[PDB]
């Protein structure tokens, strides 16, 4: 009952937020039949052709992605299956952290960057308890609800991010909770470099070759060595040598209580009912 099957006549698409090869994402509003409320939602219309055989496969995975309950993980709210499947989730008025961190390059402090690292690790730690592998962790897949509250989305999507995958994922298609730790390190690198592109100048056809010869992402200018060594431990060849999500929460939470020691940032020195693009 956590996944609600909506009728096509009870939600509206207003504006597209972006498109691609897996579907178009819209901004919209949801009014359940009877209830007298408006709910801002995001609607992702797929390109997958529906059918009694395919509809059963889509629905069964949509029930597990509606059963997550963590402050830093996004929950799937509803599905509409007609001649085209439409997925409905809550609208995150601030967008994704890649675009956010890139647009506020010159005004993000050490407290926000480290707190984002703790919040993302908590959401990935909960997914581990629920035995769900994300498989595509990146700064583009972290949504911002408020500047002090982020949530991870689009998990369990293997129903290609070569530069975010662990080495065992590139070579043998192995996706585990420890390969997610690798993707977490790259995501942290994105935040600490204010949205830079990883391995800039290297083709994706060479990423597997370049990692085994000993290459890693460089040390971000604002990070001390203590922050960088955590990120590098996420990129070890031996999967069981990478840190756990439990340990990452603890170590990054210790650094958040004295943020200026661990991040050198230029000019570094309740939230109830807040929006940004829910208007214009
Ligand atoms: C990270 C971006 C990205 O990859 N994509 C692909 C499609 C979209 O994916 C979404 N989007 C949303 N909702 C959403 C997207 C974008 C925004 N805006 C905010 C405002 C805009 N400006 C920033 C500041 N300037 C000054 C004025 C406004 C930047 C982008 C807002 C909401 C959602 C959702 N609500 O769940 N999900 C996805 C797919 C997971 C963008
Ligand atoms: C070719 N033949 C066709 C059918 C088979 C198939 C099986 C399952 C799916 C399926 C099911 C469910 C989802 C997804 C995909 C998915 O992409 N989903 C996201 C999500 O919707 N995001 C959003 N953005 C903005 C608005 S909705 C998502 C949202 C969320 F809130 C939490 C987690 C999550 O993964 C959910 C598709 C096709 C494959 C073989």
Residue numbers in the entry: 702 to 860, 876 to 985, 996 to 1006
From the paper:
In that population, activating mutations in the epidermal growth factor receptor (EGFR), a receptor tyrosine kinase, are a major cause of non-small cell lung cancer (NSCLC). In contrast to ATP-competitive inhibitors, these bind in a pocket adjacent to the ATP site, not the ATP binding site itself, and inhibit the kinase by stabilizing its inactive “C-helix out” conformation. The V948R mutation in the kinase C-lobe aids in crystallization of the inactive conformation of the kinase, which is required for allosteric inhibitor binding. Crystal structures of several simultaneously bound allosteric and ATP site inhibitor combinations revealed conformational changes, most notably in the phosphate-binding loop (P-loop), that may contribute to productive variations in cooperative binding.
